[PDB]
Design a protein around this nucleic acid. Structure first.
Ligand SMILES: O=C(O)CCC(=O)C(=O)O
Ligand SMILES: [Mn+2]
Length: 202
DNA sequence: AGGTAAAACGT
DNA sequence: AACGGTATTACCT
């Protein structure tokens, strides 16, 4: 059974690339550090975030926004690493989205207890483009639902190297991550990373 | 008129 | 602890 219409999980797809990906996460973060963003309502997110590529996802007083500038450094987000771009292209192709051209990569870091409550990815103007989501390090339970928040959820464990792609009919589906269980991973030690690639501009 | 925050407490 | 209320509103543009 496939994940959903237009959605697939490619288990361990990024396993072989993982060590290089993690080195490049560290390189990106050395320029635009991980930070826990504050919601418009004033709550600090448990996930720590940074971005690379032309556009980075951020919170603002006024809402959510894709911006070419890191508001913490006041400099452009770091360029998207070639390792990221290549892995993304290969995964998108395997998932049936060969033409995907991301201009944005959000890097999520989960410490024990960190979560991402059910939400839609909808700040992108071109919804024809899929989301490509790469898991690294400790395992997490990914929720994948429907167009409505109360639509029944699938819960899938995402392990190191797993890639999830959604788009088309499932592009706007609600999804999230349940509070991260503590553990050990030889490459990330005590955390999970996720890379989410999007076409956020035009 | 439409977009939209909640990507965030009680049972 | 899985499910669902809340935005059933108050602001922007
Ligand atoms: O960490 C994940 O697997 C999901 C991340 C996510 O939903 C997002 O970046 O919008
Ligand atoms: Mn998301």
């Amino acid at each position: 059974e496939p994940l959903a219409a237009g959605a697939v999980i490619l288990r361990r797809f990024a396993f072989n690339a993982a060590e290089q990906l993690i080195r490049d996460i560290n390189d990106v973060a050395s320029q635009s550090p991980f930070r826990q963003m504050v919601t418009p309502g004033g709550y600090t997110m448990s996930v720590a975030m940074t971005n690379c590529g032309h556009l980075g996802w951020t919170t603002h007083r006024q809402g959510y926004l894709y911006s070419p500038i890191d508001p913490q450094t006041n400099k452009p987000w770091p360029a998207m690493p070639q390792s990221f771009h290549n892995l993304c292209q290969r995964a998108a192709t395997a998932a049936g989205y060969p033409d995907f051209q991301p201009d944005a990569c959000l890097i999520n870091r989960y410490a024990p207890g960190a979560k991402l409550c059910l939400h839609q990815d909808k700040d992108e103007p071109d919804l024809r483009a899929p989301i490509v989501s790469v898991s690294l390090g400790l395992p997490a339970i990914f929720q994948f639902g429907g167009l409505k928040r109360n639509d029944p959820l699938k819960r899938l464990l995402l392990e190191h190297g797993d890639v999830v792609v959604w788009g088309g009919e499932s592009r706007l589906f609600y999804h999230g991550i349940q509070p991260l269980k503590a553990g050990f991973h030889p490459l990330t030690i005590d955390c999970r990373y996720n890379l989410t690639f999007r076409q956020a501009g035009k």
